[PDB]
Write a protein that binds this ligand. Structure first.
Ligand SMILES: CC(=O)N[C@H]1[C@H](O[C@@H]2[C@@H](OC[C@H]3O[C@H](O)[C@@H](O)[C@@H](O[C@H]4O[C@H](CO)[C@@H](O)[C@H](O)[C@@H]4O[C@@H]4O[C@H](CO)[C@@H](O)[C@H](O)[C@H]4NC(C)=O)[C@@H]3O)O[C@H](CO)[C@@H](O)[C@@H]2O)O[C@H](CO)[C@@H](O)[C@@H]1O
Ligand SMILES: *[C@@H]1O[C@H](CO)[C@@H](O)[C@H](O)[C@H]1NC(C)=O
Length: 470
């Protein structure tokens, strides 16, 4: 029974009308419907989408039993629907039991809250389905937090970790954690734009605490608008849809205050021709120094409010600035004021880019027992203090953790259960090899030794996929 692409949303709307929380998701799908339908038709012309098996897919939304996560769920469901899969949407324990009770489930999209429910509801046979799980986890899960016993040994108290999955089963909001898979979402998209209009990113007064100098510098050159705080700020209150599309289409500069971290909104601003003023974090913010991140299953350090925007887009669309550097902020605002407007969206955040990525994952990513192909492997040695993530990135590659097993001249050697191996002491030519295959980790820098690191190429604008991965 083969998957046939769908070009009509009538059935999708009927499914999402069964859950009150999808109300504004259905609205957004209608706004984006022509983009989605154009994209599934264009993909089907570029690539053979024939002879794909129709999968029975459980989509269990633990969080419905977070706007960015609701957007990601909406875009995932829409992608599955367009690709012709048999979607069973669950937002209750009752639904979960019924769907799994019926059997034939081939693929499971769930969040970590939903996974706790899955385990509790199904009992010990929950692990029978473990290889079919794709776990929507916005901020990502590094191997040291996923391995229950290693995490306990290191004193990690995360309520989110210790699931003992293959870490590539965690599906992230941005491609920030190469131990994981990047799922993302779709970003909704010069006489319109008011050259001197800036708009503050942040719907609560709390976000604005101790930003006055920053805002005062911006206010020297631009009107400061808000949707929520100095007297001069022009507040439009809470908005949406066409209205917010208009306000962003009207705005030259979208102003970050530091929070929230890694949201969709800066990408929507850039897609609508805005530049993003992106606060720089020195030191970088992590579960080690930031209350928001304490208990999150990663030590990943954020170098700015939106590191994807900073690293994968950059100027002129994204100015990553020290808020405390008055010279730097003024230079940035004056630059943006004089910039030519260039609306931009990375391919991977388009309808067709997301359809291509999720179709590849559905067809090629299998944890139930080779992809990416071993031809993609390029091995790099991380210097001491450098992670496998870093040394791949430094060569315009990305760490590919599925190649660690193929990397596991050595005068002596030993075995260790540690996220930092395989390692090489090139002084005494001593090799330490991985003794616990669940501890293979792109994340982590050896303090003394070189790390032996598995990298792969990526399609520019589609970092989730190697050139030979389609
Ligand atoms: C959307 C999402 O999950 N996104 C990210 C996530 O982001 C964080 C997350 O926080 C969700 C939690 O927020 C509050 O702490 C609570 O509302 C909590 O709800 C549980 O706990 C409260 C009491 O604290 C209860 O009132 C509520 O019923 C619920 O109880 C819990 O129920 C579950 C289901 O059975 C049970 O399994 C738990 O044991 C039980 N917990 C307790 C202690 O009783 C929320 O869970 O979402 C926020 C926005 O919604 C974000 O800002 C947060 O950063 O982060 C993770 C990890 O990084 C990521 O994987 C995920 O994608
Ligand atoms: C910004 O420019 C527009 C037109 O160029 C004008 O209407 C507006 O008054 C200006 N704002 C400030 C604060 O000077």
């Amino acid at each position: 029974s083969l998957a046939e692409i769908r070009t009509d949303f009538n059935i999708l709307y009927s499914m999402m009308k069964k859950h009150e929380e999808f109300r504004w998701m259905r609205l957004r799908i209608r706004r984006m419907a022509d983009a989605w339908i154009q994209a599934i038709k264009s993909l089907a012309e570029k690539q053979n989408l024939e002879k794909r098996k129709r999968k029975k897919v459980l989509v269990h939304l633990g969080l419905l039993t977070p706007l960015g996560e609701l957007v990601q769920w909406s875009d995932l469901i829409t992608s599955l629907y367009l690709l012709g899969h048999d979607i069973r949407i669950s937002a209750s324990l009752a639904e979960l039991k019924e769907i799994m009770g019926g059997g034939g489930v081939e693929l499971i999209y769930i969040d970590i809250v939903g996974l706790a429910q899955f385990k509790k509801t199904l009992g010990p046979s929950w692990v029978h389905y473990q290889c079919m799980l794709r776990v929507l986890d916005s901020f990502g899960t590094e191997p040291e937090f996923n391995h229950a016993n290693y995490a306990q040994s290191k004193g990690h108290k995360t309520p989110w970790g210790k699931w003992n999955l293959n870490p590539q089963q965690f599906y992230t909001m941005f491609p920030h954690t190469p131990d994981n898979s990047f799922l993302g979402f779709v970003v909704e998209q010069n006489e319109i734009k008011r050259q001197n209009q800036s708009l503050v990113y942040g719907k609560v007064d709390s976000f604005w605490k101790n930003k006055k100098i920053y805002l005062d510098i911006i206010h020297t050159y631009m009107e400061v608008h808000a949707t929520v705080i100095p007297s001069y700020v022009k507040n439009h209150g809470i908005l949406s849809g066409r209205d917010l599309q208009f306000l962003l289409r009207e705005t030259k500069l979208f102003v970050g205050l530091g929070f929230p971290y890694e949201g969709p909104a800066p990408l929507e601003a850039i897609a609508n021709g805005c530049a993003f003023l992106n606060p720089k974090f020195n030191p970088p913010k992590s579960s080690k120094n930031t209350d928001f991140f304490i208990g999150k299953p990663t030590l990943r350090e954020l170098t700015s409010q939106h590191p994807y925007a900073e690293v994968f887009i950059g100027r002129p669309h994204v100015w990553t600035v020290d808020l405390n550097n008055q010279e730097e902020v003024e230079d940035a605002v004056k630059a943006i004021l004089n910039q030519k407007i260039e609306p931009y969206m990375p391919y991977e955040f388009t309808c067709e880019g997301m359809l291509q990525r999720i179709n590849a994952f559905i067809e090629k990513q299998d944890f139930c027992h080779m992809w990416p192909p071993l031809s993609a492997l390029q091995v790099k040695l991380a210097e001491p203090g450098q992670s496998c993530k870093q040394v791949c990135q430094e060569s315009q590659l990305i760490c590919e953790p599925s190649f660690f097993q193929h990397l596991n001249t050595c005068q002596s050697s030993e075995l260790a259960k540690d996220i930092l191996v395989p390692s090489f002491d090139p002084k005494n030519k001593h090799c330490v090899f991985q003794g616990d295959l669940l501890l293979f980790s792109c994340a982590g820098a050896h303090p003394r030794h070189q790390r032996v690191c598995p990298c792969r190429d990526f399609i520019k604008g589609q970092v989730a996929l190697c050139k030979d991965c389609l």
